Design a protein around this motif. Structure first.
Motif, PDB file in Angstrom:
ATOM      1  N   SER A   1      10.380 -20.693  -8.232  1.00  0.00           N
ATOM      2  CA  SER A   1       9.854 -19.202  -7.866  1.00  0.00           C
ATOM      3  C   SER A   1       8.976 -18.649  -8.389  1.00  0.00           C
ATOM      4  O   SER A   1       7.888 -18.017  -8.194  1.00  0.00           O
ATOM      5  CB  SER A   1      11.159 -18.438  -8.018  1.00  0.00           C
ATOM      6  N   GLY A   2       8.890 -18.873  -9.864  1.00  0.00           N
ATOM      7  CA  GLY A   2       7.815 -18.628 -10.724  1.00  0.00           C
ATOM      8  C   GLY A   2       6.419 -18.946 -10.614  1.00  0.00           C
ATOM      9  O   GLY A   2       5.671 -18.015 -10.508  1.00  0.00           O
ATOM     10  N   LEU A   3       6.141 -20.149  -9.986  1.00  0.00           N
ATOM     11  CA  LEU A   3       4.931 -20.635  -9.811  1.00  0.00           C
ATOM     12  C   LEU A   3       4.404 -19.995  -8.326  1.00  0.00           C
ATOM     13  O   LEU A   3       3.471 -19.427  -8.381  1.00  0.00           O
ATOM     14  CB  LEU A   3       5.077 -22.189  -9.493  1.00  0.00           C
ATOM     15  N   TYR A   4       5.320 -19.877  -7.341  1.00  0.00           N
ATOM     16  CA  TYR A   4       5.131 -19.136  -6.100  1.00  0.00           C
ATOM     17  C   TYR A   4       4.900 -17.798  -6.228  1.00  0.00           C
ATOM     18  O   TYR A   4       3.782 -17.286  -5.667  1.00  0.00           O
ATOM     19  CB  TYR A   4       6.398 -19.305  -5.268  1.00  0.00           C
ATOM     20  N   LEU A   5       5.553 -17.101  -6.946  1.00  0.00           N
ATOM     21  CA  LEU A   5       5.366 -15.622  -7.317  1.00  0.00           C
ATOM     22  C   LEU A   5       4.151 -15.356  -8.060  1.00  0.00           C
ATOM     23  O   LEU A   5       3.479 -14.290  -7.946  1.00  0.00           O
ATOM     24  CB  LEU A   5       6.660 -14.906  -7.901  1.00  0.00           C
ATOM     25  N   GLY A   6       3.767 -16.338  -9.061  1.00  0.00           N
ATOM     26  CA  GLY A   6       2.638 -16.285  -9.719  1.00  0.00           C
ATOM     27  C   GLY A   6       1.357 -15.734  -8.967  1.00  0.00           C
ATOM     28  O   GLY A   6       0.167 -15.388  -9.827  1.00  0.00           O
ATOM     29  N   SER A   7       1.290 -15.975  -7.607  1.00  0.00           N
ATOM     30  CA  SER A   7       0.227 -15.767  -6.871  1.00  0.00           C
ATOM     31  C   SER A   7      -0.067 -14.203  -6.756  1.00  0.00           C
ATOM     32  O   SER A   7      -1.027 -13.704  -6.355  1.00  0.00           O
ATOM     33  CB  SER A   7       0.221 -16.264  -5.584  1.00  0.00           C
ATOM     34  N   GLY A   8       1.017 -13.483  -6.858  1.00  0.00           N
ATOM     35  CA  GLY A   8       0.914 -11.986  -6.812  1.00  0.00           C
ATOM     36  C   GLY A   8       0.234 -11.186  -8.107  1.00  0.00           C
ATOM     37  O   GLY A   8       0.252 -11.948  -9.219  1.00  0.00           O
ATOM     38  N   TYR A   9      -0.037  -9.943  -7.885  1.00  0.00           N
ATOM     39  CA  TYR A   9      -0.634  -9.464  -9.044  1.00  0.00           C
ATOM     40  C   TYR A   9      -0.579  -7.816  -8.756  1.00  0.00           C
ATOM     41  O   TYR A   9      -0.616  -7.287  -7.490  1.00  0.00           O
ATOM     42  CB  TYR A   9      -1.996  -9.745  -9.417  1.00  0.00           C
TER      43      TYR A   9
ATOM     44  N   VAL B   1       0.882  -1.178   0.135  1.00  0.00           N
ATOM     45  CA  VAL B   1      -0.062   0.103  -0.062  1.00  0.00           C
ATOM     46  C   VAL B   1       0.607   1.500   0.076  1.00  0.00           C
ATOM     47  O   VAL B   1       2.032   1.359   0.294  1.00  0.00           O
ATOM     48  CB  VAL B   1      -1.075  -0.030   1.339  1.00  0.00           C
ATOM     49  N   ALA B   2       0.338   2.556  -0.252  1.00  0.00           N
ATOM     50  CA  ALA B   2       1.011   3.761  -0.339  1.00  0.00           C
ATOM     51  C   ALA B   2       0.216   4.383   0.625  1.00  0.00           C
ATOM     52  O   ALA B   2      -0.886   5.016   0.504  1.00  0.00           O
ATOM     53  CB  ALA B   2       0.615   4.404  -1.592  1.00  0.00           C
TER      54      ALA B   2
ATOM     55  N   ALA C   1       6.810  -4.914  -1.917  1.00  0.00           N
ATOM     56  CA  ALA C   1       6.106  -3.695  -1.580  1.00  0.00           C
ATOM     57  C   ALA C   1       6.635  -2.250  -1.899  1.00  0.00           C
ATOM     58  O   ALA C   1       6.242  -1.432  -1.976  1.00  0.00           O
ATOM     59  CB  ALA C   1       5.383  -3.750  -0.085  1.00  0.00           C
ATOM     60  N   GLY C   2       7.973  -2.209  -1.447  1.00  0.00           N
ATOM     61  CA  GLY C   2       8.589  -0.933  -1.509  1.00  0.00           C
ATOM     62  C   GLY C   2       9.332  -0.359  -2.745  1.00  0.00           C
ATOM     63  O   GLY C   2       9.578   0.776  -2.744  1.00  0.00           O
ATOM     64  N   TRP C   3       9.308  -1.372  -3.589  1.00  0.00           N
ATOM     65  CA  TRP C   3       9.812  -1.012  -4.873  1.00  0.00           C
ATOM     66  C   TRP C   3       9.321  -1.597  -6.188  1.00  0.00           C
ATOM     67  O   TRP C   3       8.910  -0.840  -7.103  1.00  0.00           O
ATOM     68  CB  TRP C   3      11.493  -1.194  -4.903  1.00  0.00           C
TER      69      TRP C   3
ATOM     70  N   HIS D   1      -5.327  -0.979  -2.470  1.00  0.00           N
ATOM     71  CA  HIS D   1      -3.979  -1.310  -2.537  1.00  0.00           C
ATOM     72  C   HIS D   1      -3.497  -1.365  -3.962  1.00  0.00           C
ATOM     73  O   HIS D   1      -4.129  -1.325  -4.973  1.00  0.00           O
ATOM     74  CB  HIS D   1      -3.906  -2.757  -1.928  1.00  0.00           C
ATOM     75  N   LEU D   2      -1.957  -1.423  -3.843  1.00  0.00           N
ATOM     76  CA  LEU D   2      -1.422  -1.356  -5.449  1.00  0.00           C
ATOM     77  C   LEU D   2      -1.221  -2.851  -5.756  1.00  0.00           C
ATOM     78  O   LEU D   2      -1.060  -3.143  -6.909  1.00  0.00           O
ATOM     79  CB  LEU D   2      -0.263  -0.834  -5.191  1.00  0.00           C
ATOM     80  N   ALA D   3      -1.260  -3.772  -4.784  1.00  0.00           N
ATOM     81  CA  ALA D   3      -0.952  -5.129  -5.212  1.00  0.00           C
ATOM     82  C   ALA D   3      -1.097  -6.025  -3.975  1.00  0.00           C
ATOM     83  O   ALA D   3      -1.046  -5.968  -2.886  1.00  0.00           O
ATOM     84  CB  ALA D   3       0.475  -5.460  -5.593  1.00  0.00           C
ATOM     85  N   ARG D   4      -1.566  -7.371  -4.034  1.00  0.00           N
ATOM     86  CA  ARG D   4      -1.552  -8.427  -3.137  1.00  0.00           C
ATOM     87  C   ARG D   4      -0.625  -9.319  -3.624  1.00  0.00           C
ATOM     88  O   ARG D   4      -0.720 -10.105  -4.719  1.00  0.00           O
ATOM     89  CB  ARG D   4      -2.976  -9.056  -3.103  1.00  0.00           C
TER      90      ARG D   4
END
Ligand SMILES: [Fe+3]
Length: 322
Positions: free
Chosen positions: A313-321, A92-93, A120-122, A243-246
């Motif tokens: 890593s790819g699969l794990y991070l794929g949960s974000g957006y 969040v910002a 979140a910070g960059w 929010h900017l992303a989850r």
């Protein structure tokens, strides 16, 4: 034998040995301690078998999964509470109430970030802000583009010599200024929020729970609100709608081949039961000495959730957006 944890700073190394002594005292699984000076150093230390595990923010889980390291997340931090656990969080910002500028009007303002290349910070914020930057793309360092966007910022880890603007707002004294460690008072989530609380910056890119956890007087929460990606401002408790992303939680990574996953998980499982949230008063696995930031694990983590096999890593991070 024995799981070898990797610290990215002296203070983390110190906590690791304290963790080690306590595990021995309670006769639980042992944990050895390796000391390095950065996430990337631990990643390679693990790759070359000089260490077995290290906890990383999404931005580094990504770098850890690239060749020639090929590391994989094996355990994720859990947040929230025992009743309402979550293996994700929201970037969040946060800003001070009273202003009128929106997310699309940050040009020329002052910013506070958790650290260079952290989620979140960059990664999320600078990603969400690209359309407002005048970045000519590679070979130009994205840092140059943001350093000419914000009038000044505190981006722990940024090169103080190449992009001084990115470090000008940082509070560290001497060479500690802009450090990617607890040496810098504005480092990480809590540090970036402090950078805003102190008035050094106009906006802080952190996660949803910081304001609630860092203010010892809930009445001070009324002084803050969030910048939503729809260009409106809403209360700090409305992060779900603003929010900017989850993104997926920070995670412990290990070698994808002979990484000792079973042993690492057994250590974490046992460490959680004995020194986890509200367990032993002698040692807290989730806590850092005064002024220290998220040593070894996020100070706000409450436990672990094992990552099923064959998930890189790819699969794990794929949960974000975004
Ligand atoms: Fe993070």
């Amino acid at each position: 034998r024995s799981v070898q944890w990797c610290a990215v700073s002296q203070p983390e190394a110190t906590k690791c040995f304290q963790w080690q002594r306590n595990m021995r005292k309670v006769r639980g699984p042992p944990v050895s301690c390796i000391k390095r000076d950065s996430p990337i150093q631990c990643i390679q230390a693990i790759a070359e078998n000089r260490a077995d595990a290290v906890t990383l923010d999404g931005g580094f889980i990504y770098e850890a999964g690239l060749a020639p390291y090929k590391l994989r997340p094996v355990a994720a931090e859990v947040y929230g509470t025992e009743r309402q656990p979550r293996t994700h969080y929201y970037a969040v910002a946060v800003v001070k109430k009273g202003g009128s500028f929106q997310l699309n009007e940050l040009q020329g303002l002052k910013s506070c970030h958790t650290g260079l290349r952290r989620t979140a910070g960059w990664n999320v914020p600078i990603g969400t802000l690209r359309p407002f930057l005048n970045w000519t793309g590679p070979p130009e360092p994205i840092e140059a583009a943001v350093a000419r966007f914000f009038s000044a910022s505190c981006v722990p880890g940024a090169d103080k010599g190449q992009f001084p603007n990115l470090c000008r707002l940082c509070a560290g004294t001497g060479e500690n200024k802009c450090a990617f460690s607890s040496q810098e008072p504005y480092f990480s989530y809590s540090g970036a929020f402090k950078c805003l609380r102190d008035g050094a910056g106009d906006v802080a890119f952190i996660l949803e729970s910081t304001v609630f956890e860092d203010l010892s007087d809930e009445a001070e929460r009324d002084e803050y609100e969030l910048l939503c990606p729809d260009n409106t401002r809403k209360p700090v408790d409305k992060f779900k709608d603003c929010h900017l992303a989850r993104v997926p939680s920070h995670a412990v990574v290990a070698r994808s081949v002979n990484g000792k996953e079973d042993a690492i998980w057994n250590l974490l499982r046992q460490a959680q039961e004995k020194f986890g949230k509200d367990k032993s008063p002698k040692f807290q696995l989730f806590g850092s000495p005064s002024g220290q930031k998220d040593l070894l694990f996020k100070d706000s983590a409450i436990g672990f959730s094992r990552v099923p096999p064959r998930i890189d890593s790819g699969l794990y991070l794929g949960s974000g957006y975004f």
